Symmetry: C3
Subunit: 267 residues, 3 copies
């Protein structure tokens, strides 16, 4: 498009006409979504209110849990194996409150999620099988995010969504009858410091906190005394951006902006 | 000695470090342009490569990976794609006056982040002793390609470590010297350029040399990439009041370590 | 909390009342700290004046040096092995100047510090043995920090402070008689672009510079011509933030803010 005079015009038209980027109803046509969490409890903590709205709308929400949450206890009589078995049941109960009926467990060990082609292949197999319309994952660019399983889950989610569409990537999936990932309409990153789309969850907030507290091994009373205010305050930070009390924030960009794009901060 | 941080900083830059962004590529005779995939050098700095070649600077590509994954055409294997892209790059490079291409042959999507890859880059630095090195900026936000982030880090690392005789010492044992000798790094594909090359004049040649990578840029893909690539170029060019530009981040060598005020340049 | 009106009010109550955070005197109660450095000389460069002030207050300061500094010369007649043995001696003399009596050498090769569970277990064994009240380490989010041993030390130090409190993490430590890390009261990150606590080192600058120069393999006169003004300029950058001539900066945050937090820039 050789005749536009200003960057600001080129940018507006690139987004609205060339890429048809829309932040007004980005989940509009979604029939099936995957919600990718590093640990058991992260989908509900990051976006439980939105999962419920999606389910209320008849969207099929499927979790993919990267790790088993093996390490998340300070109880010296509770082994990692026993804790992982308990957290699987806690996630099932939590997910059921939010209308989720399927969880893919990848079973990597908590604190030890690899950053590797292998983990991309696991995600790629699920994407190719399920062909979701949209995928949710943490923002790996969150500053001061000190948990490796978080940063890696975000990177590996975005990478797999792109690479799962290439037939020479993990080519054995196609040899067993799966198609390339054909169907996706969006990625939405939660746990983000740069949200550009907010779901009002004011009405849903008590359901969210309830479904979070179902992860009892994680949230005994003394930890909840700190975590409840922390989670309320995060929801208010997001809410305020659309003038509501409580929200969940997502960063959504056109697919090209995830590569070589020097003006990602303009959205 | 001096009164304020401001004075300290200005002095440090101008007199102690002699940092000049008016003409950073002034004395360059040989440069390495390090790209993650075949086409990255032409997309990110093709116009600048042309300008450099036209002024008699020798431009040498180092391409980290083989572009094996880059197709959705199920009739084309990665081996065949790789072979096609080597030829696409050779033709695209010829258009820009480019000489010589080192192919490292790591598989696309699988470039390792490791001492091994730093030794490969180091061997080339010590052999070629370039005046300057260009690479993607690994700090680019929302850069989701690991081949890009890893290439950026590894280049900066290798420019540093190839200067050290205990690093990859078998190089010296076979008769290579440590890398002098470069006077700069410049990062392209950067959100924080502080040097902009006007390429308004060369934009058409740039687009032609990009399209030479035909496996990457069929018509339906070009419908989106041409507006994107033009908008990028307008983004950079607007910063210096020209139509189409190419942006680079250049900093003094000290600033890539322990420096809390890098955003001041 | 469900009754707080605005995000701005919730954030303030969270920070001050729930998390009890303030930066009036963060190092106040400390009897023992670990100063974790990527290379020999990094503690003194990043925080030497502070180390001396901690030793002057009777705090036991202990270094953990991740790597051997094997690569850090341009002298073609000096092997890395010889350099490593030299730099150990340099660090010992540097450390004695600042009142430090104990250094754990992990002995990873310089330029080759792994980013792995193994290195977290090394740091966890020392945390569990020492039970320090605080830990200092480089900020791994420093922009344009190009040295992988720096970013890796920072991330591993933060992770280790957290995972070492978990008894299923590196569980053989417990089996041989070490307790989980508790005692911990803070992490302070030095080499930071986002300091929120400044230590005035104006009258200690000359001692800090002498203690840096004791690392002679690193700072012969021709290198010092550049590094002395560089190091002065950094110290002025931090000092200016509290209206003094030379400072050392640290970033300190509540434990919760190192995870899933989208407003860490408000502190
Ligand atoms: C809210 P979360 O992300 O789920 N909390 C995780 C927990 O799941 C995990 O078991 C633990 C050990 O890695 O670190 C905690 O930080
Ligand atoms: C502009 P580019 O960096 O060269 N485009 C790359 C292409 O080379 C590569 O084959 C593919 C799969 O990794 O990803 C694409 O995103
Ligand atoms: C101030 P420093 O962080 O200690 N300087 C280091 C030095 O210790 C190390 O041997 C060399 C090679 O890795 O890199 C330099 O950048
Ligand atoms: Zn988590
Ligand atoms: Zn260091």
């Amino acid at each position: 498009f050789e005749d536009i005079d200003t960057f600001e015009e080129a940018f507006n038209k690139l987004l609205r006409e060339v890429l048809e980027f829309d932040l007004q109803n980005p989940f509009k046509d979604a029939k099936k979504v995957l919600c990718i969490e590093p640990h058991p409890d992260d989908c509900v903590i990051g976006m439980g209110g939105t999962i419920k709205k999606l389910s209320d709308m008849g969207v099929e929400v499927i979790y993919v849990c990267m790790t088993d949450g093996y390490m998340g206890t300070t109880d010296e009589s509770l082994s990692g194996h026993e804790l992982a078995a308990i957290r699987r049941k806690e996630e099932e109960e939590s997910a059921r409150l939010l209308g989720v009926k399927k969880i893919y467990w990848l079973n990597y060990r908590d604190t030890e999620l690899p950053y590797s082609r292998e983990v991309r292949k696991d995600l790629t197999k699920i994407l190719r099988k399920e062909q979701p319309d949209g995928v949710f994952a943490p923002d790996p660019w969150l500053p001061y995010e000190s948990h490796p399983d978080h940063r890696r889950t975000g990177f590996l989610a975005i990478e797999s969504v792109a690479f799962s569409q290439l037939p020479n990537f993990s080519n054995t999936d196609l040899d067993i009858g799966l198609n390339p990932y054909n169907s996706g309409s969006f990625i939405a990153l939660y746990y983000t410091h740069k949200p550009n789309y907010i779901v009002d969850i004011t009405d849903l907030m008590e359901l969210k906190l309830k479904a979070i507290r179902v992860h009892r091994s994680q949230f005994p009373d003394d930890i909840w005394e700190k975590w409840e205010p922390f989670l309320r305050t995060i929801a208010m930070f997001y809410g305020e951006k659309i003038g509501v009390r409580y929200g969940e924030g997502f960063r959504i960009m056109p697919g090209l902006f995830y590569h070589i794009t020097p003006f990602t901060d303009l959205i």
